Design a protein around this ligand. Structure first.
Ligand SMILES: *[C@@H]1O[C@H](CO)[C@@H](O[C@@H]2O[C@H](CO)[C@@H](O)[C@H](O)[C@H]2NC(C)=O)[C@H](O)[C@H]1NC(C)=O
Length: 482
């Protein structure tokens, strides 16, 4: 049995089931999600290898070879048609065309389930999915349960990395008009103990970590690489239960009556489904979604325990984020442009601006150093890497407003994430392509001889698809600074 077979047996059937990694029903063999590649904007679907099995990652790799891919749709496996598509603008506009939120990269969250390769949904700030015409989802004060397997190490404090029930108008219609899982360390509303992140329940105009608005000591920080967040709500009752998705049981962080504030009892759920954003489309949060469902009815603890048992059995393990030549920590290199007509240029920097310049044996000692980089273990992820300036030790290449800058490491999580890049076999076959760890839809890309963290097509001029593949491919050579 799969998670939804378990919920069905527990008398609280799934009304929405989403996952890019595996089938959530033992009998499901349909499409798990849809992909769209940047080379020609064509699409294709990825289905389980077998009924109730793991996604066919090989099919994705084949379709996405020598180009970039986006996850356009996360299909609803229940049959209710509650598929998740690109989230629309609402109370807040997204950063994409006409206010839509960004689609997620198809390769930002590689994993293996019991040894089989699969891809999760790595969501950077601005990314979001939604379905504002869902069927079967609880409305009003109707009871529902839900869970999601997330990455407890991928999060931030901006509103709001949610998965669950929200408004069908994509706007904030008041307290009680939402009921969704939240994972992050926002403290604007509720928050738990420690540094976070915390699993909280977004009931609109409030993220709740317990009965009181604001701080609630009963909700602990949970930072497992794979987190199972289980939330449920019914008539004047709700609960938060969490666990290490890779091992053990769910622990109850909260179970009791609704927060005693106007609008939360009875609830006024609208039934829309959101992923990675807030009800009003607040889109500043980040996180990773692997699988999750929403049910009709209030799940018993026993039913959820069986679901957690199943998740553990799926055996989630982190996958490889790197491919191609790659590097070794401590190694010093110079990166050469491969785009025809700019092949004598190297990645360098003029003060804080990262750019490309013609550097050769005749260059000054200073310029040779500005075109030389010490490759160190990724500041935000040990699999990837960070690039430290040779002339300016202590400073690394980092993206800011999608421009690559050379700034001093302040030791903060944010800097670390902005400064971590994962090597990928060059899209044009020449060398390597450095993919941003925090924004996997973006890569080192030279445009007008300046370096950016650009996507294959986008709202920024430097996201131009023209010569993208060549512009994000660099040959790794001996450092000029020796
Ligand atoms: C959420 O967690 C992060 C990570 O611990 C906090 O970020 C730090 O941010 C402050 C404020 O900018 C800096 O003094 C620290 O140097 C940062 N620490 C790290 C480890 O990066 C963030 O402040 C937290 N947010 C809230 C609202 O509590």
């Amino acid at each position: 049995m799969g998670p939804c077979d378990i919920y069905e047996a527990g008398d609280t059937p799934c009304v929405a089931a989403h996952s890019t990694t595996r089938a959530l029903y033992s009998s499901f063999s349909g499409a798990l999600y849809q992909l769209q590649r940047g080379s020609d904007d064509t699409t294709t679907t990825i289905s389980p290898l077998t009924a109730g099995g793991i996604a066919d990652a090989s099919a994705q790799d084949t379709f996405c070879a020598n180009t970039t891919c986006l996850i356009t749709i996360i299909y609803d496996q229940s049959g209710n048609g509650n598929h998740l598509t690109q989230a629309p603008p609402g109370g807040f506009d997204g950063p994409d065309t006409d206010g839509y939120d960004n689609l997620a990269s198809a390769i930002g969250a590689p994993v293996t389930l019991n040894g089989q390769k699969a891809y999760g949904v790595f969501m950077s700030p601005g990314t979001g999915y939604r379905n504002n015409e869902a069927t079967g989802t609880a409305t009003g004060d109707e009871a529902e349960g839900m869970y999601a397997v997330l990455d407890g190490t991928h999060y931030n404090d901006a509103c709001c990395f949610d998965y669950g029930n929200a408004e069908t108008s994509s706007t904030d219609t008041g307290a009680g008009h939402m009921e969704a899982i939240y994972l992050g360390n926002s403290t604007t509303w509720g928050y738990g103990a420690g540094d976070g992140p915390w699993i909280m329940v977004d009931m609109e105009n409030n993220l709740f970590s317990g009965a009181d608005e604001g701080y609630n000591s009963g909700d602990p920080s949970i930072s497992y690489r794979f987190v199972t967040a289980a939330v449920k709500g019914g008539a004047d009752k709700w609960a938060i239960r969490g666990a290490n998705a890779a091992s053990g049981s769910l622990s109850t962080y909260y179970s009791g009556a609704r927060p005693d504030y106007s609008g939360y009892n009875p609830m006024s759920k609208e039934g829309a489904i959101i992923l990675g954003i807030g009800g009003d489309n607040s889109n500043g949060a980040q996180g990773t979604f692997y699988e999750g469902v929403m049910t009709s009815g209030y799940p018993s603890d026993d039913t959820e325990n069986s679901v957690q048992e199943n998740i553990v059995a799926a055996k989630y393990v982190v996958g490889s984020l790197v491919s191609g030549p790659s590097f070794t920590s401590g190694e010093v290199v110079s990166l050469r442009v491969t785009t025809p007509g700019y092949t004598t240029r190297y990645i360098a920097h003029t003060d804080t601006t990262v750019n490309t310049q013609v550097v050769d044996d005749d260059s000054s000692t200073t310029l040779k150093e500005e075109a030389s980089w010490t490759v160190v273990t990724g500041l935000a992820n040990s699999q990837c890497f960070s690039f430290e300036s040779v002339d300016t030790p202590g400073s690394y290449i980092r993206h800011y407003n999608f421009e690559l800058l050379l700034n001093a490491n302040d030791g903060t999580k944010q800097f670390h994430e902005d400064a971590t890049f994962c090597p990928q076999a060059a899209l044009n076959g020449e060398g390597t392509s450095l993919r941003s760890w925090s924004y996997p839809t973006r890569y080192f890309r030279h445009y007008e001889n300046v370096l950016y963290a650009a996507s294959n097509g986008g709202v920024q001029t430097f996201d131009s698809k023209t010569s993208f593949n060549n512009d994000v491919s660099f040959e790794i050579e001996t450092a000029f600074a020796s």
